Amino acid sequence: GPAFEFAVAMMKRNSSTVKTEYGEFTMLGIYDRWAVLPRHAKPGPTILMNDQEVGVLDAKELVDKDGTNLELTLLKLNRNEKFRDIRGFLAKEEVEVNEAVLAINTSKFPNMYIPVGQVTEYGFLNLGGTPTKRMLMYNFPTRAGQCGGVLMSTGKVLGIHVGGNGHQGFSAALLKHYFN
């Protein structure tokens, strides 16, 4: 109950639906005008956010100290509204939880919440052909269209859904240090 209550308020206040030329994704605003999308959404100079064209002022594909993919792209958006600052909900290091909720907000999956069970630090995973670290794994028949989904537990935003192999789903951990 508490994790779903947390997730609902979090999506209401900080999530949106984004369409790029590579698909439709759930997007999570972090603070000010900075939001995150899975890297493979490959946002261009403009994205459709909630059906409307929003310019992207800056985009950064996150990588670790070795240059290894983290599968996250941080975007600075050209719009007046500031996102509610959720950085205090982001851990300093990968969080393993016994119960997590995956929240999706797309045209196809508007306001949907999925209890995915145990989340474990999976680590390295060759995703869509690329070595990727800091993956959090959960055992759910996950699909595309869930990409960008927000993985949460009570009072914690754990990561963003970036992939799956038809049986397990994986989220890029959303670490505090990525946003200062």
In this structure, the answer to whether residues 44 and 117 fall within a common structural domain is no
Tally of domains within the chain: 2
| Cα–Cα distance list, 127 to 7, 42, 55, 69, 115 (Å) | 26, 15, 28, 9, 23
Structure tokens given for 33: 């005008």
In this structure, the answer to whether residues 162 and 94 fall within a common structural domain is yes
In this structure, the answer to whether residues 57 and 125 fall within a common structural domain is no
Q: Who's near 101: CB < 8 A, 6+ residues apart?
A: 3, 4, 6, 7, 113, 114, 115, 116, 151, 152, 153
Domain boundary among 50, 83, 116: 83
Structure tokens given for 137: 């794994």
User: What CA–CA distance (Å, rounded) separates 71 from 133?
Assistant: 8
In this structure, the answer to whether residues 133 and 75 fall within a common structural domain is no
Q: 151 with 102: CB under 8 angstroms?
A: yes
In this structure, the answer to whether residues 147 and 69 fall within a common structural domain is no
In this structure, the answer to whether residues 108 and 154 fall within a common structural domain is yes
Q: 168 with 107: CB under 8 angstroms?
A: no
Residue 49, classed as helix, strand or coil, is strand
In this structure, the answer to whether residues 120 and 140 fall within a common structural domain is yes
The distance between the two most distant Cα atoms of the chain, rounded to a whole number of Å, is 40
User: What CA–CA distance (Å, rounded) separates 73 from 158?
Assistant: 16
In this structure, the answer to whether residues 33 and 118 fall within a common structural domain is no
In this structure, the answer to whether residues 7 and 39 fall within a common structural domain is no
User: What CA–CA distance (Å, rounded) separates 103 from 111?
Assistant: 7
Strand partners, 36: 28, 74
Domain boundary among 83, 101, 128: 83
Could you give phi then psi for residue 173, rounded to 5 degrees?
Answer: -65, 145
Selecting among 40, 53, 93, 94, the annotated active-site residue is 40
User: CA torsion sign, 131 to 153 to 107 to 169?
Assistant: positive
CA atoms within 13 A on the CB side of 68: 14
Region label for 115, one of left (φ > 0), alpha (ψ between -120 and 50) or beta (otherwise): beta
Domain boundary among 83, 98, 123: 83
Q: 168 with 140: CB under 8 angstroms?
A: yes
Residue 178, classed as helix, strand or coil, is helix
Question: What is the CATH classification number for the domain harbouring 76?
Answer: 2.40.10.10
User: What CA–CA distance (Å, rounded) separates 86 from 76?
Assistant: 15
Selecting among 24, 71, 94, 161, the annotated active-site residue is 71
In this structure, the answer to whether residues 161 and 102 fall within a common structural domain is yes
94 catalytically annotated: no
Q: Who's near 177: CB < 8 A, 6+ residues apart?
A: 92
In this structure, the answer to whether residues 45 and 19 fall within a common structural domain is yes
40 catalytically annotated: yes
In this structure, the answer to whether residues 179 and 90 fall within a common structural domain is yes
Selecting among 24, 94, 147, 161, the annotated active-site residue is 147
147 catalytically annotated: yes
Residue 155's CB is within 10 A of a number of other CB atoms, namely: 11
Provide the domain limits for residue 94: 1-14+84-180
